[PDB]
Amino acid sequence: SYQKLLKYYVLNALKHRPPKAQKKRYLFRSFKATKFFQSTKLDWVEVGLQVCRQGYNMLNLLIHRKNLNYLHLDYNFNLKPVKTLTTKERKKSRFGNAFHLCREVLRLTKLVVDSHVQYRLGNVDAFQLADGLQYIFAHVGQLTGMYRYKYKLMRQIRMCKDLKHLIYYRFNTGPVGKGPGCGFWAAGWRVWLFFMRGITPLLERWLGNLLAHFDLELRAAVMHDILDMMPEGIKQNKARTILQHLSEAWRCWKANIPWKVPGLPTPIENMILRYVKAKADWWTNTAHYNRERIRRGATVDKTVCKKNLGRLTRLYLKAEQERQHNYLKDGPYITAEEAVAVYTTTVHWLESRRFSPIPFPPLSYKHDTKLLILALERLKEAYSVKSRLNQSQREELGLIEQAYDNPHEALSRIKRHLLTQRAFKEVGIEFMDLYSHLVPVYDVEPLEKITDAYLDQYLWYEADKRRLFPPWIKPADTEPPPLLVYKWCQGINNLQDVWETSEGECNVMLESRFEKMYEKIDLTLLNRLLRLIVDHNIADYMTAKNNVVINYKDMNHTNSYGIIRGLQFASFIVQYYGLVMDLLVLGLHRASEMAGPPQMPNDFLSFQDIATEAAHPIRLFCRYIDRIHIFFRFTADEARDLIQRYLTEHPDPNNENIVGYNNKKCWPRDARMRLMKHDVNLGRAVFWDIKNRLPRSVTTVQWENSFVSVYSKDNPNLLFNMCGFECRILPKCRTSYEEFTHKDGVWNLQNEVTKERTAQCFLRVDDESMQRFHNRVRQILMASGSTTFTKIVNKWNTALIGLMTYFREAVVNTQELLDLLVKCENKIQTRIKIGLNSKMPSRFPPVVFYTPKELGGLGMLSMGHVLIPQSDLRWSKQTDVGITHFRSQLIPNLYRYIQPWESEFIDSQRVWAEYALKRQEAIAQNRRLTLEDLEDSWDRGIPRINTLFQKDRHTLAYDKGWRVRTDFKQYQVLKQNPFWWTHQRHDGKLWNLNNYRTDMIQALGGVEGILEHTLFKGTYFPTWEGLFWEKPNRRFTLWWSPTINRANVYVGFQVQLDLTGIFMHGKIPTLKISLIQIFRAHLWQKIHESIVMDLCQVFDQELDALEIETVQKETIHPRKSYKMNSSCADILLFASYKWNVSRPSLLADSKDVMDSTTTQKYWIDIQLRWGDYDSHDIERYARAKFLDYTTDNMSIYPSPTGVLIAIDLAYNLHSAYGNWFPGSKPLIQQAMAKIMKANPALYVLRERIRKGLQLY
């Protein structure tokens, strides 16, 4: 309180503004000047009473001036409605916050004045008056409730509380004990006076009132200016014609067309052009602003957002047309000598490799059918099983299935297209809206699609056969990117004395992008390069394929510079151009050293001899599709020579090199790169050296998109970003000096020769990857709209599975990603809740979300700490013995059910060595490896062992370059692929969550426990095992209704359903319509009538033996069936004798004591109910209703002795608590058994609810 008071004191003293100069004008002098006011001198209390009454009268006049009389404003200024308030009436009584603020201010005034009146009358004392005033001015939020009508009032309320705390703890010292005896009201009184200084103008304005298409606008203004400069006579002819010309100009600008109207006058055309330019500028600004808002996270409808994207498409399309124009004007940006240099480099490399050029596919290739089948299968992957197949969509499937029908004619057609087809059709393009960046996607004609797919398969197979691509080129088919990172880290750690810096040696790890790789590939130079490794006809085909017009909606251009990047063989083209770039970067000598001699080529990261390894600074090299990762090791001399060369080319006198250095900001400061002068200069030097080797016209490496991390005697950490992983290698001998346990994100690197832990590789998730996932979830929520809850949860589960199976240990190490995951999970749950009900609930049971889909729930995979409350694992099951209650805890998380990448890799290596041993011992046995063997290695091996037993394994063995093909699939298919890195067919299945589902069901409380919160017990199905669903949000909310409409989750409720016994805790309109339909045609009243009739028939059949005179059908009011608040009598028994009745006991109370009394008449009452999850206990309900109605005044019962049978229709439960005479208890038990075996109306209700639930 002290500190908070000081805060506002300092803010007042600091935000203080000079009092503005003005002219003295006084309100009250003006009032006295007029003849309407007069002056006197009164006691303060009298004036307080007058002001109270005047405010009361003015509020009443405001209320009554609209001639309404259904709200009552009492003297203490409580505005209570007269009666239950109607929706139309709930629109006239909308006064505003100002009205209630003024009413509560008058309530405060009334409290003060009435306190003074109490003092004056002699009711209280002066000390009591002062204490009351301080209490009023301190406890104002608990006496008025003003803060609801203005939130800023919490500042004043908290300030008054702070003053209370500051004053009391000095007042209550020594003999003065703690209690209500302080009356120092001079502080709160001041606080509540400075509030009235500010709101007085506001409330007077309110009482003063109560009492006595920007682009379209700009176009309209331009047209109005034209009309102002226009003759009056021609206004119905040219005004529309001029507007039509302006619209045509806007359409042409959107399509990048040269709109021109020769008939239009030159000044008119100039004005139209100015208007078009203004509209284009406004459109560009608005599109950029909306794109930035969407990327930041602003929410908008999918249609307007799609309009914004399509606007951005046109801007990019115009920019690409312009780029093609500049290339057509500036010619080949690459120089002729640069061209011949790169061409000589590649020919030297390929003759060094003794490469055999890929020939044109002969007619009778051994595998041509196989590759065609693979291409058709890959095309079919795009077409998932769906009903949305347009003319072109179904044409593509017709064509690929025809190719399946007759492979030979298809192969002949492909070969003909290769040999002859040089001109093609326009390629359509759209864009995936990754909120970080827009990715183009290209739509190619289906015949051309098949041709390109077959060419891609054929060329990749041949290149894999001929070893065109050295091992450093990635991604490879044998290894997923997560294993790429692990092998890179191990290769770094296994270099010769890589972590030694005593002499001063420095390691440098560089990563870059090959900026604008796809765009800056000259097609003529591309053709020349392709002509060496492939037949000239095939090269001509693929190069002509990228010289093709691209269209979108209306705007189209031809592509002469860039590569289409959506073609099926674009993968091969990019991977070959990248190889040529690697020849440029490494140089022929070092490239040969890494690749190894042609007959015995090296693996990913290995050399023939360690001397070959240490023969150059460049130890490791690994190019992704366009990324490059180079690892240098320099001696002191080499590093200083490179630094000297760089500084000679780019002198740095003032040490300005420390300003533009990219760092990994996600790591702690001590774990980042330490920007010492020597290390910074070395990194800049090595980057400049690498950049110089690449001619700027072919491709560029930009510093601000690169990251060069130097490990030396100053920087003990080596950092790099590879394939979305954020890795930091820290050697054990270097700054570790600490025993380490097993941490999930940390990889224990060890030397392959001595098996000693020399380093640790800490793992993290890329900021780019986290942002991509967050944008995916944002797309899921924003593009939800009218979709079913099941579809939203399916998309969320797909996203979470992709992220958690790609970044296995990294997500565990990355705390920010854990927080983002929990936030997104809560956002998904909140959107589901809002769809369920507009009001945000409290403590929504998670059993609704996490229940498996087959079990009726949504099946949300969990990545957060959710504590299932112990009250949610309670269920009851009723049999003839009675109702039995049982109980069953943290919800399991995904990351426990996915094996870590490191364990997966070591297990894969061990299991595949085991498989090699078993395979050799078996072809020694001359048999085939069976299922019985390798069964202990079933779900093991990164190439899953299961892939050895597939049917297409021979066919899949001819599918080369499938991983890069999958990576390029995002460039052709309109669906984002979370599993762009792996293939189910080749790598198998890398994760298993069946155990997760089982532990899920166990955690929610078992099948029964899940079903308790459902309406299953209403279906009266004897078991759950034999049921099935019919593949829904209405069915979903109705299914989970008993646990959603409970009083706990929604409070301030229980509006009764009409002609129905159902309480709806909260306005749940979907549940409301379901319940209206499920209780149509007075179903509740029919239930009550039929059960009463059944009991009457049973009791007539058992009249004499129970010593009964007769049975009387007591007059039941038509609304008595749904009358909860009170009750009446349903069945009346006359004994003709005096029965001996017992103390009121439950139906199952086999042990009952006599009431020691007698009676003649016995009333039987039935109370029907719709029990929710919390209050489905029929026994408690029956006992409470029986003991309440008997002792009630509005429930008239003929005799004090009787029974009240309560039937829970929701859970098919029953219990009777009333008195029992001889034979009444077992007969009533038999009666309820028979009634729930065969009651026509109860059966009708059960069948109806089964229909509504769609559960059979």
């Binding site: 203004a221 001029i242 619209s247 239009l264 006058p265």
Partner: peptide, 27 residues
């Protein structure tokens, strides 16, 4: 404002004669 930017073309608009007005085509 918008008309403040369009004022130059608006003033140059009145320079045109009426023979080019009824000849204005439609889209």
């Amino acid at each position: 404002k918008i008309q403040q930017q369009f004022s130059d073309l608006k003033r140059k608009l009145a320079e045109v004669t009426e023979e080019e007005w009824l000849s204005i085509p439609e889209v």
